[model samples]
Structure formats: C-alpha cells, structure tokens
Target: QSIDQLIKARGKVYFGVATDQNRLTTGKNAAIIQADFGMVWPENSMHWDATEPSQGNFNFAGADYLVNWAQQNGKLIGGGCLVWHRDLPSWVSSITDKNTLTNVMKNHITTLMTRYKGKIRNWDVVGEAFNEDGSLRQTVFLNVIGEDYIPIAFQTARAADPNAKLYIMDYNLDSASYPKTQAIVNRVKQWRAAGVPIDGIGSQTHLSAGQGAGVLQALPLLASAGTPEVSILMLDVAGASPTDYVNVVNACLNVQSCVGITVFGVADPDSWRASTTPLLFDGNFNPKPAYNAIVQDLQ
Candidate 1:
C-alpha cells in the first residue's frame, strides 16, 4: 500500500521525502517514491544559490525538472529556505549596503515564489534562524537587516504567494522545552502581534534513538504557536529504530494541527548525514525496519 495514500486516509496531510534530481532519476529510488510518498521537497535546487546563483540571474532547470516530475507523478511539491543561512550565494553575503541586501532578498523571494505560485503548497520562508541558546543566528539577513529580517522574509514570501503556506523552521525544535523552541514561539508571537503573514512552524525533526518522546511534546506547542499548522518537514532517525519512527508518527497522528511528515531523504546513502543512518530505506532501496514501523503506524 502507498504510505502517502494510507496516511491521508487517516487524516494526516501527506507523507513525503526530500530528494534531489540525481536521486529522483534513479530507477529504484524513483520507484519507491511513487509507491510510498505523496510529496517531494527540492533538496537544494530551490535555494538562494541554486535559484539565483548571481544577482537577478535566475536558473530553474533543475527545479523545473523536479516540479514537472511531481506533476506527472501526482505528487505534491513543498519548497524550502526562501531565506536561510546556508546554500547562500557569495554575492549576497558580500553586500554591505542594507538597502541592496534587502532588495536582493526581496527579489530572491519574489522571483522564486512567483515562479512557483500556487503549485508548491508550502515553503520554509525562513529557517534555522535561532541558535540553541535562544539567540538569533547572525546570518547575513540578521546581521545586515537586524532582527527585522524575519518579518521581512515572511512578508515578502506572503506577498509573492499568499496561498502558499509560509513556515519558520529549525533543528532541535521537536523538544517543546528546548530554549530554541521557546524562542521561536516568542518570535511568532511578536510577528503575530505585528500582523505578519505566518502560517506554520516547520520542524526539522532530526532525532537520535530514544528521542521520540520529544516529538509528542513538541507538536501541541508548535500547533498553538501563533498559527494552527505545523509540519514535520524533515524527520530523520539516527539510530534506525522502528520505535523512534512509531513514536514520531504517533506524535503527528495525535496532533490535529500537525499537517504531515517528510523524511529527510528517500534512503540512507543520499542523506546529508548518511553516516548516522538517518533514513527509512537502506543503500539498496530496501525498506528498513523503521519504514515498516511507519507503515504499521499509519495503519
């Protein structure tokens, strides 16, 4: 049975994976995606560097291929890092004038979001902006535009595509009690007060063994944080435990506002942290124990 179909039948939004063009074209990997997932996030092709490598010079060949493939396969598309510290172009980083930086940022968001428009359902409007200590990360946006960059990013994305859900995302936020989690909620509150166009919290649920309990605690808080939607945008399991997968699934299942879950990658070999064994499939495209656990959990 298709896990995506099964989960949506149970009222979850979608089950998906974050994969790139390289893996998407592979026979075995592509087969599993068709069989098991409903949504796909472009791993890097949608980022600042990939979309707009040089200022105002846009290239969407790689991203266009993924979007076209998703359309052909009847899969939903998710976007990411409209504003993020990583995968950023050097030109963007080298800019010293605040107005130039803001214009470039706005252009980046507008061009990318407008191009996708209503097709991609959601986006990580701003991601990984806070440190573990509850302080904001000094990315180019923050350093140049100061704290206002958060709202600026969200505002630009909202204007570019109002229907596409905008999300604030980061790692280690699955633990509701984490300082970073609280800090994000605090900012969401501020943004809400100021009428920022926010829709959801995107969680990078990158977990180790025995940390699934945190997911349960994380959902309710995330759901209530200035917005009613939350998505497990990237759920990776370090210990390759079925128990961890089950707990994560149950957390999303129990939370009415938890939209869906997207595994970091289709399988182990392609993950950014593949050494940690952070996926539901092995190097051979075989479903691992964690994959079976998720299937059973959805059932």
Candidate 2:
C-alpha cells in the first residue's frame, strides 16, 4: 500500500510531501509522489512571491499546475501561506496607508481562496506571525494594519472559502524553542477565545536528533488550546537517524489531536537544505532508513 493508505489504515492521519511545479511534472518526482504520498503541498508555488508577483497582477501558472495535478490524481492539496511577511513583492512593503494595505491583503486572499475554493483542503492563512520572544513580527501588515491583521486575514480567508480548513503556520516549535512554542500556543488560545476563524495550528517540525522529544511535549499544549487539527507541516529529519524520525512520528501517532504530518521533501537532493538529508528518500529516489522507520511504525 501507499503511504497514504498505510496512514489511513493505521488511523485518521495523512502522510504528505512538499513538491514544486517543476518536480510535479518531472517523471521521477511525479512517479514517486503518485506511488508513495497521499497529499501534496507546493513548496513555493502558492507563496506570496509565486502567486502574485506584482500589484493586482496574479500569476497562477506554477500553482495551477500543482493544484491541477492534485485534483486529477485525487491527492489532497495543502494550500500554503496566504499572508506572509517574506517572499512578498517590492510594492507591498512600500504601501504606507493602513486602509490600502488591508484592502490589498483582503483582495489577495479573496482572489486566491475563491479561485481554489473547495480544492484546497487546508490553508495557512497567516504564516510566521510571531517572533521567538512571543512578540509579533513587525511585517508591513502588522506595522500598518496593527495587531488586528491576523484576525482580519483569517476572516477574509473564511469569507472567500468557508469550507477550507484555515491554519496559522509557524516555525521552530520543536523542543529547542519551548518559549516560542508556548507563546504561539497562548496566542492560538487567545485567538480562538476571541472568535477568530482558526481551524488548526501548524507546527513546522524541522527536527534534529534531540528535538523530537520537544515536539512531542509541545503537541498536547497546542491541542489543549482547542485547536485539535495540529499538523507537523515540515518534518525534515536533519542531523538525525531513522530512530529519530520514528520518535517524531510516534509523537504524532500518540496524540489524538495531531491529524497529519508532511515531510518537507521527497528526496534529499531536492530539499531546500539538501546537504542535511532532511527527507525520507535519498538522492537516488530510493526510500531511506527514515522511510522504513515510518513504515514500520505505521504497520
């Protein structure tokens, strides 16, 4: 059985991979994706840079390609960031007016969310909104739109696609950053209490050997905040062994609220941190020890 099938057979968990437009069309990558993974997330296609490179001018060529492929093959499409500070066009940071910035954010969310609608299973409405010290990151949106930017973004996303699961995504949530993890958990609690349309919290588990235990500890804290659909968005097994991968997966498996896990890349060489061997597959597209560990645990 495929990874998806195995995960489902074990329980209500999904196994996903991050791929780009180029890889989706490549014969080797495409074949691996279809045969092994259950869901697909565009590594960069759906980000601010790729989707809307200029003001009011949208380019969905790369994003559309992946979305279409997912639909055609019955794979779940994990829609990435809608509002992020990085990877934005040059014009976005130059906007000084609060109203204009708000309008721009809403327009972008509406356009993309409406276009995809039910196709995208989950969307990271706001990405990396917090600093390591539990302070909000001073993005253009935050500076202009104030602290209300996050709620507004989530609201706008809901208005466009009510059916899609909306998420708040962030990084460094593993054991190494306990304070950062707790800060985000508190924020999610505060948001939910205020009626923010947040469906889940995404923990980007960019892990190493000793970090898996930290992530395991952080899971219950996040789930206790009433956001049960916690996803380990980027499970890169950096500087770790197959046993480390198993530990991370076992953490999710043990948690009733942890819904899914998405490995950052399929093959090591294609990964953004290629030198780190952060993926379950090797450079030659063969399943690595980490992949076997996952399979063993799931079975």
Candidate 3:
C-alpha cells in the first residue's frame, strides 16, 4: 500500500529535468516538462566509448536525439546515462587491467542495450557504481568489471530492454548509512540472485535541507531489497535552502516505500556549479519559496 500510494493512486507522481540542447530551445524551460512533469532524458553523450572505443564503430546518434525528445513530448522517458564518466568513449579509460575490463563490460552492455530496445522507459542502468563505503568506486566500470559489474549491468539491461525499468543510481547515499546502506542492500541481493533485471531503487535525492528526515530512514532499507514488485526511485530531489519546503513534503509523507518522486533541476536556476547551493528553481522561472513550498507541500 506504499509505493507512494500506488503512485498517487494511479496519477503516477512525476516531475524531472536535466534536459539538453540549450534547455530544449529555451521554451521558458519546457514549461515544467509541458506542465505535467515526468521526464529524465539525457541520452548517452558517447555511450561506453562510443560503442567499443577501439573496436567496431557504433554510435546511436546521441541516444537517438534523446529518444526523439522523449517521443516528441509525450514525456515519460527515463534513460539519461547507461553509465557515466564523461559519457565514456575514449577507449573506456584505456583498459589497464582486469580481463580487458570484463570484455569491455560485455561489449558495452551488448551494444548499448541492443539500441534502446523497447524505446526506453526506465534505465539508469548502473551509474556512480559505488563509493560511500560499498567499495568498487574506481570507475571504468569499477576498474574493469570488478564486482561482476553490478550483475553485468543488470544482466545486459535484461537482455536489452526486455521490458525496461532497471535503475541503480547514486549520489548522497540514498539513505541510512552503515556500510553505505549495507552496500546497497548487499548489492540488491546480488542483483536478485543472478537473474539480474532489477526494477527500481535510485535515490539521488540530493536533498540537503535537513536531508529529508534522513532519506525517510533510507526507504525501508531499500524496500527490503526488491521482488515484491520493486520500485522506489526518488532521484535528485532538490531543496537545500528556500526553507526546506514543508520538510521535504514531510519527508515524502513519512516514506511509504516511495514509488516515484523526482523534483531535481526544476530549471536549474543555478548553484550546481554556480555554487551557493540553493537547490532548484532560481535562474529566472521563479518559484523559490522552496519551489512554491513544493507545490504547497504537494497540495
């Protein structure tokens, strides 16, 4: 009964950003994702050494133009990076060890998840691999697919989008602490006992205003660790000053296994590098009483 009340009883809670192409033609910032809010598109800038840095050439034209601009605005896309580090491409950090970095991470996730298989839906496909204490944070796919590269990057993204939905992101230790949230619930129980096809668990809740009640106690240790219909995404939610916006919506309504919850760069007003860290909404598209107090504390 959690999952954020089954995604707000069906409406499916959403609201994201991080777009490109000069904020999609500066349409006053995509009118807040066309007024609906549900986008996480950033398309692989140079996906894993442009499909095998020194091998056969392959590059799906910048993640197919950010998936044709999230299918031309019917927004619902969530496929920013299939692994980062300047969008890998330079012969993948010059393989300096580990079995050619596990065959270049299974040939770069079987050629970029078989070319966006089902047209994308959910897939951070393993980013920021680790480093709060869980270890394997050297990069280059954990210094050459060390910890089995997070179950072969969710088993090659479930064999290239066998019905998308695979996360495993990072930033700000999702929640709890000890050994980095028990090494992300023991590596999502070893990527679900090897079958690997994780569904949801991104936390980048960049929350800073009192840290959203400690990430709602780390979302039930990441929902006990998948299976019973897993899903807990809350990527990069902002709020470091304007006054903590209703205590971050009362810490996501006291964390009821948050199904989905994003509010990151609502226009990237500034501070992500401009410094002064004020979180979201600032550059101009005003609304910074902590973003209208988070829409009046989620209405």
Candidate 4:
C-alpha cells in the first residue's frame, strides 16, 4: 500500500500544504504528500479577506480549485476563515472598531463556510484568539468582537455546516505558558456549554527542541476541552537542526495526546543553511535527518 493508505490504516489522517488555492502538489516530490495526515490552513484559500475581498462579492475560485483537487485524490480537507492578520484585505483595517469588524468577520465566516459546507472535513473556525496569558489577541478581529468573537465564529460555522468538525487553531500557549492554555480551555468549555458546536482544539505545535514536553502537557487540557476529537496541528515541529529531529520524534512517540504531528516542511526551511529552525527536507529536495526520524516513528 502507499504511504497515504498506510497512514489511514494506522488510525491517522493525511494532509498537505495549501500554497494558495492550488492543489497540494509537491512538484516532483510526491513522498511529502503521501505521509501527510490531512491538508489544512489552506494557505490563503479560505481566509475572510481572500475569499471575500469586497462587500457582497465572494470569490471562492481559488479555494474551490484546491478543495476539489483534495477530494479527487481522496485526501481529507481542513481550513478556516481566519489566519495571521496579514491575510486580511487592506480595507479590513479601516473598520478597526469592534462592531464593524465583528460584522465583517461574521459575514466572512458565513460566506466561506456556506460555500465549502459539506466539502471540508474540519474547519479551523477561529485562529489565534489569544495571547500567552489567554487575554484577547488584540488583532483587528478581537478589537471589535472583544472576547466573545472566538466562540461566536465557531457557533456561526456550526450553523453553516452542522456536520463539519469545528476546530479552534492557535499557537504559542502550547506549554511555554500555562495560563494561556488554561484560558483557552476555560473558553472552550464555555462554548461547549453554550452549545457552540465546537468539536476540537487544534494545538498548533510549532516547536524546535526543548519545546516538546511543553507541547505534550497541553494535550490533556486540549483533549479535555474538545471531548470528541482533538488535534495536535504540528505545522512547524521538525527540529531546530537536522540532528535535533531524532529527539523531536522520540518526544512525539512518548506523548499520548499527540494524535497528529505535521513536519513543517517535507522540504527544509525556506532559507536552509541560513536558518536554524525546523524542516523535513533540505532545499535541494533531499530528506533531512528529521525526515528519516519521522518515517521511523510512523513505521
């Protein structure tokens, strides 16, 4: 069986990157695509501003292209309507106040979710909702929606697609900070009690070396927050260096909460030699030590 088939058989999902609205194609390198757990972040595909740049004008051409491709290949789809602040349109900032921004996000979520309803398996309904202390993230969305927006987004998404799994995706508070994790957990409970329909907590495990333990500890809380299904969205968890990948793999294997681990890049960091962060392949398309470590762990 192929690597993708094996992952499914092992009780794991598969995913690939969304460079844009384009297909998750690793050019000539298909191995990277085969080992994935499911595609997410959809690059700029499903972001509010990207999907609806202007009022009443929705453009899902890009995201649809990618989603259809994933379906054709039998790959599970995951994406959201929010992301790093940079993905929003320039006009979005003009409505800096809470009410206008809240409306903007509400409409965005409604439109995007409505368009991809049954197609996507999971939705990162809300992204980066808090700081290290679990306080409001202070972004354009929060400045207007206040603390209520996070759950509100999930609720809206649930309304749009009752069958789709909803996820709250974020980074930083994994373990280096506990209070933030607490805040997230508490908020998730509130949403669940309020009938928000949030099904999972996506702990974006972007790690280097010593960060694994912290990531693991946050899992039980995450799992507790979203009882049915929780995910460790390892967007960038390869290693600080090639040698460090081994330790990263061992850490992941030892952790019980890590339902999924995504090596940032099947290829190396954008700037390989100049960068000291994480990646699975070198720029030359050669598998790095961490890549081997991942293969071994999954084996």
Q: Each model's TM-score? A: 0.97, 0.97, 0.32, 0.82
Residues 119-185, candidate 4: write the lDDT tens digits: 8877777777778878767777667667677767777777888878877777765673478788888
User: lDDT score, residue 31, model 2?
Assistant: 89
What CA RMSD would you report for each candidate? Answer: 1.2, 1.3, 15.8, 3.4
lDDT of 3 by residue, 109-187 (tens): 6676677678766777777777777875877766666667777767766876688777777666655775766687787
lDDT of each: 0.87, 0.85, 0.60, 0.62
lDDT of 3: 0.60
Global lDDT for candidate 1?
0.87
Runs of candidate 1 exceeding 4 Å displacement: none
When 1 and 3 are scored with TM-score, the better candidate is 1
Candidate 3, run of 10 with poorest lDDT: 1-10
Name the candidate that leads on lDDT.
Answer: 1
- Per-residue lDDT of model 1, residues 95-198, tens digit only: 88889999998998899899889999998889899999889999888888899888888889988998898888988887888898888888888888899988
lDDT score, residue 121, model 3?
A: 69
Clashing pairs in 4: 13-37, 14-36, 14-37, 14-38, 15-36, 15-37, 15-38, 15-39, 98-144, 268-281
Model 2 residue 237 CA deviation in Å:
1.4
